[PDB]
Design an enzyme around this catalytic site. Structure first.
Site, PDB file in Angstrom:
ATOM      1  N   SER A   1      18.029  15.664   7.216  1.00 14.83           N
ATOM      2  CA  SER A   1      16.894  16.542   7.030  1.00 14.83           C
ATOM      3  C   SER A   1      17.274  17.610   6.046  1.00 14.83           C
ATOM      4  CB  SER A   1      16.486  17.187   8.347  1.00 14.83           C
ATOM      5  OG  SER A   1      15.470  18.143   8.123  1.00 14.83           O
TER       6      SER A   1
ATOM      7  N   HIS B   1      20.012  21.958  11.394  1.00 15.15           N
ATOM      8  CA  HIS B   1      19.761  23.220  10.696  1.00 15.15           C
ATOM      9  C   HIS B   1      20.393  24.496  11.218  1.00 15.15           C
ATOM     10  CE1 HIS B   1      17.040  21.130   8.044  1.00 15.15           C
ATOM     11  NE2 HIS B   1      16.448  20.598   9.099  1.00 15.15           N
TER      12      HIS B   1
ATOM     13  N   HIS C   1      20.466  23.371   2.142  1.00 18.09           N
ATOM     14  CA  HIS C   1      21.499  22.578   2.813  1.00 18.09           C
ATOM     15  C   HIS C   1      20.938  21.272   3.362  1.00 18.09           C
ATOM     16  CE1 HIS C   1      19.826  24.888   6.325  1.00 18.09           C
ATOM     17  NE2 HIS C   1      19.803  23.655   6.792  1.00 18.09           N
TER      18      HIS C   1
ATOM     19  N   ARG D   1      12.161  14.438   9.603  1.00 13.91           N
ATOM     20  CA  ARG D   1      10.735  14.588   9.414  1.00 13.91           C
ATOM     21  C   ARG D   1      10.240  13.662   8.308  1.00 13.91           C
ATOM     22  NH1 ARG D   1       7.007  18.738   9.485  1.00 13.91           N
ATOM     23  NH2 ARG D   1       8.042  20.361   8.241  1.00 13.91           N
ATOM     24  N   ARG D   2      11.107  13.391   7.334  1.00 14.80           N
ATOM     25  CA  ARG D   2      10.766  12.512   6.221  1.00 14.80           C
ATOM     26  C   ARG D   2      11.277  11.111   6.535  1.00 14.80           C
ATOM     27  NH1 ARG D   2      12.594  16.988   3.219  1.00 14.80           N
ATOM     28  NH2 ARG D   2      10.904  18.164   2.200  1.00 14.80           N
TER      29      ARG D   2
ATOM     30  N   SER E   1      16.834  20.915   3.502  1.00 15.14           N
ATOM     31  CA  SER E   1      16.367  22.276   3.660  1.00 15.14           C
ATOM     32  C   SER E   1      16.166  22.710   2.216  1.00 15.14           C
ATOM     33  CB  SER E   1      17.427  23.133   4.346  1.00 15.14           C
ATOM     34  OG  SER E   1      16.976  24.463   4.488  1.00 15.14           O
TER      35      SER E   1
HETATM   36  C1  LIG Z   1      14.222  17.780   8.741  1.00 11.58           C
HETATM   37  O1  LIG Z   1      14.067  16.396   8.781  1.00 11.58           O
HETATM   38  C2  LIG Z   1      14.197  18.371  10.192  1.00 11.58           C
HETATM   39  O2  LIG Z   1      14.135  19.601  10.381  1.00 11.58           O
HETATM   40  N1  LIG Z   1      14.254  17.498  11.206  1.00 11.58           N
HETATM   41  C3  LIG Z   1      14.234  17.868  12.628  1.00 11.58           C
HETATM   42  C4  LIG Z   1      15.385  17.200  13.403  1.00 11.58           C
HETATM   43  C5  LIG Z   1      15.097  17.129  14.909  1.00 11.58           C
HETATM   44  C6  LIG Z   1      12.924  17.459  13.261  1.00 11.58           C
HETATM   45  C7  LIG Z   1      12.072  18.412  13.798  1.00 11.58           C
HETATM   46  C8  LIG Z   1      10.870  18.038  14.404  1.00 11.58           C
HETATM   47  C9  LIG Z   1      10.514  16.696  14.473  1.00 11.58           C
HETATM   48  C10 LIG Z   1      11.354  15.737  13.940  1.00 11.58           C
HETATM   49  C11 LIG Z   1      12.553  16.120  13.336  1.00 11.58           C
HETATM   50  C12 LIG Z   1      13.076  18.365   7.875  1.00 11.58           C
HETATM   51  C13 LIG Z   1      12.752  17.418   6.735  1.00 11.58           C
HETATM   52  N2  LIG Z   1      13.459  19.666   7.336  1.00 11.58           N
HETATM   53  C14 LIG Z   1      12.784  20.778   7.623  1.00 11.58           C
HETATM   54  O3  LIG Z   1      11.784  20.793   8.344  1.00 11.58           O
HETATM   55  C15 LIG Z   1      13.323  22.059   7.002  1.00 11.58           C
HETATM   56  C16 LIG Z   1      14.073  22.859   8.070  1.00 11.58           C
HETATM   57  C17 LIG Z   1      14.781  24.068   7.495  1.00 11.58           C
HETATM   58  O4  LIG Z   1      14.930  24.180   6.272  1.00 11.58           O
HETATM   59  N3  LIG Z   1      15.239  24.978   8.371  1.00 11.58           N
HETATM   60  C18 LIG Z   1      15.116  24.903   9.799  1.00 11.58           C
HETATM   61  C19 LIG Z   1      15.915  26.139   7.909  1.00 11.58           C
HETATM   62  N4  LIG Z   1      12.282  22.884   6.405  1.00 11.58           N
HETATM   63  C20 LIG Z   1      12.178  23.034   5.090  1.00 11.58           C
HETATM   64  O5  LIG Z   1      12.941  22.487   4.292  1.00 11.58           O
HETATM   65  C21 LIG Z   1      11.049  23.934   4.605  1.00 11.58           C
HETATM   66  N5  LIG Z   1      11.577  25.002   3.759  1.00 11.58           N
HETATM   67  C22 LIG Z   1      11.415  26.286   4.072  1.00 11.58           C
HETATM   68  O6  LIG Z   1      10.803  26.659   5.071  1.00 11.58           O
HETATM   69  C23 LIG Z   1      12.028  27.299   3.109  1.00 11.58           C
HETATM   70  N6  LIG Z   1      11.192  28.480   2.937  1.00 11.58           N
HETATM   71  C24 LIG Z   1      10.766  28.842   1.733  1.00 11.58           C
HETATM   72  O7  LIG Z   1      11.039  28.205   0.709  1.00 11.58           O
HETATM   73  C25 LIG Z   1       9.917  30.104   1.658  1.00 11.58           C
HETATM   74  C26 LIG Z   1       8.701  30.040   2.580  1.00 11.58           C
HETATM   75  C27 LIG Z   1       7.726  31.193   2.290  1.00 11.58           C
HETATM   76  C28 LIG Z   1       8.501  32.459   1.895  1.00 11.58           C
HETATM   77  C29 LIG Z   1       7.605  33.562   1.357  1.00 11.58           C
HETATM   78  N7  LIG Z   1       8.422  34.754   0.946  1.00 11.58           N
HETATM   79  C30 LIG Z   1      13.451  27.703   3.602  1.00 11.58           C
HETATM   80  C31 LIG Z   1      14.182  28.452   2.496  1.00 11.58           C
HETATM   81  C32 LIG Z   1      13.342  28.612   4.817  1.00 11.58           C
HETATM   82  C33 LIG Z   1      14.248  26.453   3.972  1.00 11.58           C
HETATM   83  C34 LIG Z   1      10.024  23.074   3.852  1.00 11.58           C
HETATM   84  C35 LIG Z   1      10.707  22.316   2.735  1.00 11.58           C
HETATM   85  C36 LIG Z   1       9.382  22.102   4.812  1.00 11.58           C
HETATM   86  C37 LIG Z   1       8.956  23.956   3.270  1.00 11.58           C
END
Ligand SMILES: *[C@@](O)(C(=O)N[C@H](CC)c1ccccc1)[C@H](C)NC(=O)[C@H](CC(=O)N(C)C)NC(=O)[C@@H](NC(=O)[C@@H](NC(=O)CCCCCN)C(C)(C)C)C(C)(C)C
Ligand SMILES: *[C@@](O)(C(=O)N[C@H](CC)c1ccccc1)[C@H](C)NC(=O)[C@H](CC(=O)N(C)C)NC(=O)[C@@H](NC(=O)[C@@H](NC(=O)CCCCCN)C(C)(C)C)C(C)(C)C
Lengths: 230, 230
Positions: B123, B54, B140, B148-149, B125
C-alpha cells in the site's frame, strides 16, 4: 495505573457451543441434545478455556455449561493475568479497538480486543459418530470463528450482563447457569509471539466474517448491543 | 542456532503498488502512469521507508527500487530490521499455516512464509492527486494484510532476482531497471504487542481473501510458484 488494573480484571465469555437447530456441514460435528444432556449429567472439575485449542494457551476455565432449548450454552472466565496483560497491550494498538464500542456502551479495550480476535467458541469433545454414547467434554476454545454455526462468543465484565445478551435464554436458563458459575497459578504458558503466530492462521479461514455475521444473526445478538465487532 | 541466523537474514519484497489497467473503487486512489513517471523523475535520492500498515513506528526496511512498467508501478524493497525479523521468526514457529509449509518444490522458510501470510499486500503512501498541481510525492510503502489498490499483492523471497522473477508481466528490461536501483540503526520502534494489535484490525477488512486471490490472479503470480498463501 488504576485504569490498567480495571483493564486487566477478569473478563467473562458466553455463547452457544452448539445449536441443535443447526445441521453441521460435516458429520463429525454432529452433537445432538440427547447426547449433550447425557454427557453433561455424565461428567466436577472445570473445563479449561484456551486460545484456538492450544494446551499452552489456557487463559481461564469454563464456569458453567447448560443445555437450553436452542442448544448447548456455556459461560466461562478469562482469568490469566499474563494473557490479559498481553491483551491489554495489544488493544492499545488496534485501530478497531480505538474506534470504540457502539451506542451507549463504555469503551473497554481489553474486552473489545477479545471481542474482535476471538469472536467464536469451539468445543473439544469426544468423537460422537453414533456408537457407545469418561469425560466427553475436553475443553472450550476461544477462536476467530467456530466450526459450528451459532458459536459466537460474547465478552463482558459481568456474567449476568453476558448471559443477558442472548434473547433465546430464559430466566430459568439464566438461573441454571448462575447456579454453576457462583489451576494453582496462571495457566497461560504462552506469549505475544504465539498469539501473533496464531493470528496469521486466522487470516486464512474461509468466509470468516460472513459466518460470524450469520452466527451473530442466528443467536440474535445483532438486536441487543454488545462489544461484538462482527 | 545457525538456522536461526538464516531465518533472520534480510528478506526482499516486490509487487505492484498500482495497476494502470485497474480503475480504483475510489477517486482518491487514482494514480495514472503519466503522473507516476513524472513523480518518479521528480524525486530516487533518499530511499522510501518500508513499514507495517502505515505505522511510522513500525518501519521494517526501505524501498530499494521503484520502476514504472507497462502494467503499472512496480517496487522492490527489503525487510532489514532485526527486531522485526526476530519477532517474525518467533511468531512463525507458532503458525499452523507456516508449519504446513510451502508449495511443490520450494523449501520451507518460516519467516518469509509468515510475512507472506500476514502482509500479502502493498500500500503506497503518496500525495493527493485529485488532478491539479501534479517536493516528494512518494512518502513510503507499507506491507499490509491487503491493499486498497487491486494488484498490489506482495511477494517475499530471500533473493531480489527470484522475487522479480515471480511476476510474468515484468520484462528483462524491467528487471534490469530495477536491478540497477537495488544496488544508522534499527528503524523498528514497535513490538509484538503492536503487530498483534494490528492483527485484529486486519481480521475486519472486508473481502480480504477474495481480493488477494483477485490480486494473485491479476498479477499472474498464480501461475508461478511462490510463498504466497492467498
Ligand atoms: C493502502 O493499500 C492501505 O492503506 N491499505 C490498508 C491495509 C489494511 C487498507 C485499509 C482499508 C481497507 C483495505 C486496506 C492504500 C493504497 N494507501 C492508503 O490508503 C494511504 C495511507 C497513508 O498514506 N497513510 C495512512 C499515511 N493513503 C494515501 O496514500 C493518501 N495520501 C494522503 O492522504 C496524503 N495527503 C496529502 O497528500 C494531503 C491531503 C490534503 C492536505 C491539505 N493541506 C498523505 C501525505 C497524508 C499520505 C491518498 C493517496 C489516498 C490520497
Ligand atoms: C472449533 O470450533 C474449532 O476448532 N474452530 C477452529 C478455530 C480456528 C476453526 C477451524 C476451522 C475453521 C474455522 C475455525 C471446533 C468446533 N472444534 C474442533 O474442531 C475440535 C478441536 C479439538 O478439540 N482439537 C484440535 C484438539 N475437534 C473436536 O472436538 C473433535 N474431537 C476429537 O478429535 C477428539 N478425538 C477423539 O474423540 C478420538 C478420535 C481421534 C481424534 C484425533 N486424535 C479429541 C478428544 C481429540 C478432541 C471432533 C469432536 C470434532 C471429532
Amino acid at each position: 495505573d488504576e485504569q490498567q488494573s480495571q483493564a486487566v480484571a477478569p473478563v467473562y465469555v458466553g455463547g452457544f457451543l452448539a445449536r441443535y437447530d443447526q445441521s453441521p456441514d460435516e458429520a463429525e460435528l454432529l452433537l445432538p441434545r440427547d447426547v449433550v444432556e447425557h454427557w453433561l449429567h455424565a461428567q466436577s472439575v472445570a473445563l479449561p478455556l484456551n486460545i484456538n485449542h492450544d494446551d499452552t494457551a489456557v487463559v481461564g476455565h469454563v464456569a458453567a455449561m447448560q443445555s437450553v432449548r436452542d442448544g448447548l450454552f456455556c459461560l466461562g472466565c478469562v482469568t490469566s493475568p499474563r494473557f490479559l496483560e498481553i491483551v491489554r497491550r495489544a488493544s492499545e494498538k488496534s485501530e478497531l479497538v480505538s474506534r470504540g464500542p457502539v451506542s451507549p456502551l463504555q469503551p473497554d479495550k481489553v474486552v473489545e480486543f477479545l471481542s474482535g480476535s476471538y469472536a467464536g467458541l469451539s468445543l473439544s469433545s469426544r468423537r460422537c459418530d453414533d456408537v457407545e454414547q469418561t469425560t466427553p467434554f475436553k475443553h472450550v476454545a476461544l477462536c476467530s470463528v467456530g466450526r459450528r454455526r451459532g458459536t459466537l462468543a460474547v465478552y463482558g465484565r459481568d456474567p449476568e450482563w453476558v448471559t443477558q445478551r442472548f434473547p433465546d435464554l430464559t430466566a430459568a436458563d439464566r438461573d441454571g447457569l448462575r447456579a454453576q458459575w457462583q489451576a494453582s497459578g496462571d495457566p497461560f504458558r504462552s506469549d505475544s509471539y504465539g498469539l501473533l503466530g496464531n493470528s496469521v492462521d486466522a487470516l486464512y479461514i474461509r468466509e470468516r466474517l460472513p459466518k460470524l455475521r450469520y452466527d451473530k444473526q442466528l443467536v440474535g445478538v445483532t438486536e441487543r448491543e454488545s462489544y461484538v465487532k462482527a
